[PDB]
Amino acid sequence: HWGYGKHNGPEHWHKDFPIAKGERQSPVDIDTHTAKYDPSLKPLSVSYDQATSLRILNNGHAFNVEFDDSQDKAVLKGGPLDGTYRLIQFHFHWGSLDGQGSEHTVDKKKYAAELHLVHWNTKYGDCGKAVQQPDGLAVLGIFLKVGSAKPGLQKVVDVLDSIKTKGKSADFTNFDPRGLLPESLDYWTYPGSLTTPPLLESVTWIVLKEPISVSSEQVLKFRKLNFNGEGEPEELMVDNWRPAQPLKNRQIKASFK
Ligand SMILES: N=Nc1ccc(S(N)(=O)=O)cc1
Numbered sequence: 001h002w003g004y005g006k007h008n009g010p011e012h013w014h015k016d017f018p019i020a021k022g023e024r025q026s027p028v029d030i031d032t033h034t035a036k037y038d039p040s041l042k043p044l045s046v047s048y049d050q051a052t053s054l055r056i057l058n059n060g061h062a063f064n065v066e067f068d069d070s071q072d073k074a075v076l077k078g079g080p081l082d083g084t085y086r087l088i089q090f091h092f093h094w095g096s097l098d099g100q101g102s103e104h105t106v107d108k109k110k111y112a113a114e115l116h117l118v119h120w121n122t123k124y125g126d127c128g129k130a131v132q133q134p135d136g137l138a139v140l141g142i143f144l145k146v147g148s149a150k151p152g153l154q155k156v157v158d159v160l161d162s163i164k165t166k167g168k169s170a171d172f173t174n175f176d177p178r179g180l181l182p183e184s185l186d187y188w189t190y191p192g193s194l195t196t197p198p199l200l201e202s203v204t205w206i207v208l209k210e211p212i213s214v215s216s217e218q219v220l221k222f223r224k225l226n227f228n229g230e231g232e233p234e235e236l237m238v239d240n241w242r243p244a245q246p247l248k249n250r251q252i253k254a255s256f257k
Pocket residue numbers: 116118139193194195196197
């Protein structure tokens with residue numbers, strides 16, 4: 001099945017998922033000179049005060065921190081969004097080296113990693129129904145660069161030894177995702193897709209301009225995870241990013257002048 005290797009990676013995905021060559025695929029390169037400030041964008045509201053984390057899971061492609069989304073507890077509103085989007089999970093994409101790992105790029109610059117906070121539109125009742133709609137999901141993307149440690153990330157980093165291999169999970173309650181945000185909420189936005197199979201074209205992307213800084217030691221611990229299951233030959237979980245896809249008939253809008 002699909003992955004990030006030579007034999008099952010992004011260049012192969014179109015065979016099982018023909019939408020891979022579609023009209024609104026993600027990620028994309030953000031050309032900062034071509035992105036236009038949009039005054040019609042309303043203020044972006046990240047309301048994570050009552051977020052209730054449950055569990056962390058190695059799914060063989062990345063690790064997901066999962067949230068209780070049975071009520072409006074952690075939500076994203078405003079900006080390009082109509083209505084309320086509920087946080088369901090976050091995960092990261094990262095590289096084998098500090099010079100690659102992000103999915104989105106900014107004037108062709110690749111960051112060391114990218115955080116995706118995944119939200120679904122509550123008008124569709126559940127995330128499974130939402131992902132079948134053009135305005136079903138909103139993903140908040142945050143770049144990671146290597147520098148100073150991110151204190152709010154360390155609790156994630158410390159649990160990774162317990163979920164080394166595919167299918168392993170651990171309790172992960174009382175994690176505050178507000179500790180992963182940068183100071184500024186300036187962003188770019190465009191209509192796109194999931195960046196992994198099934199590549200469904202159901203995502204409003206909101207990509208923050210300001211990266212967060214994480215330490216070399218923090219990212220090195222991401223790179224000790226395994227794509228493989230327990231007892232199987234070790235394949236380090238690195239370079240789990242899809243490269244930039246054609247922008248086609250899309251405009252990237254900026255929230256800032
Ligand atoms: N669980 N399905 C998915 C959710 C988010 C993404 S991404 N990478 O586009 O944020 C991919 C798949």
